[PDB]
Curated annotation (Swiss-Prot):
Residue numbers of the full-length protein present here: 181 to 313 of 349
Subcellular location field: Cytoplasm, Cytoskeleton; Cytoplasm, Perinuclear region; Cell projection, Stereocilium
Subunit: Interacts with G-actin; ADP-actin form and capping protein (CP). May also be able to interact with TWF1 and phosphoinositides, PI(4,5)P2. When bound to PI(4,5)P2, it is down-regulated. Interacts with MYO7A.
UniProt family annotation: Belongs to the actin-binding proteins ADF family. Twinfilin subfamily.
Top-level taxon of the source organism: Eukaryota
Tissues of expression: Ubiquitously expressed (at protein level).
Name of the protein in question: Twinfilin-2
Modified residues (Phosphotyrosine): 131
Chain's gene name: TWF2
Reported function: Actin-binding protein involved in motile and morphological processes. Inhibits actin polymerization, likely by sequestering G-actin. By capping the barbed ends of filaments, it also regulates motility. Seems to play an important role in clathrin-mediated endocytosis and distribution of endocytic organelles. May play a role in regulating the mature length of the middle and short rows of stereocilia.
Free-text description of this protein's post-translational modifications in UniProt: In vitro, phosphorylated by PRKCZ, CK2 and SRC.
Length: 135
């Protein structure tokens, strides 16, 4: 595959220049494309609020942190799947496109992903969790 809508493409271009720090994407199942939801400014503390309870989402997050006195800004990919609230078709479609989306982001948009994470609940996305996953 499903191609990125141009707005989604532009969001990735911005993320690469660190002009945004957060991107939310979803599948547009009518056109079979990847659609930008938003790129609202998001600190680590607000990150859990970006994860819907009722629909699967893709997220890219610029995690600005320090690893052993060396400050870093790492792009974290998060696939969120609230199993209790998504249909088996939705789960399957988001899982299947996940691999394809990441191929394009790395291969066609030249974005370095420090870590790929799968969650079911935004509440999992603490600073402690992000630290442990990235490092």
């Amino acid at each position: 595959s499903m191609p990125l809508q141009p707005e989604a493409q532009r969001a990735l271009q911005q993320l690469k220049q660190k002009m945004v720090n957060y991107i939310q994407m979803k599948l547009d199942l009518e056109r079979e494309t990847i659609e930008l939801v938003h790129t609202e400014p998001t600190d680590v503390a607000q990150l859990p609020s970006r994860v819907p309870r009722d629909a699967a989402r893709y997220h890219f997050f610029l995690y600005k942190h320090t690893h052993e006195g060396d400050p870093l800004e790492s792009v974290v990919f998060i696939y969120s799947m609230p199993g209790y609230k998504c249909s088996i078709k939705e789960r399957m479609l988001y899982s299947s496109c996940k691999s394809r989306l990441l191929d394009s982001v790395e291969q066609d948009f030249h974005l370095e992903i420090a870590k790929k994470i799968e969650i079911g609940d935004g509440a999992e996305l603490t600073a402690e969790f992000l630290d442990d996953e990235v490092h």
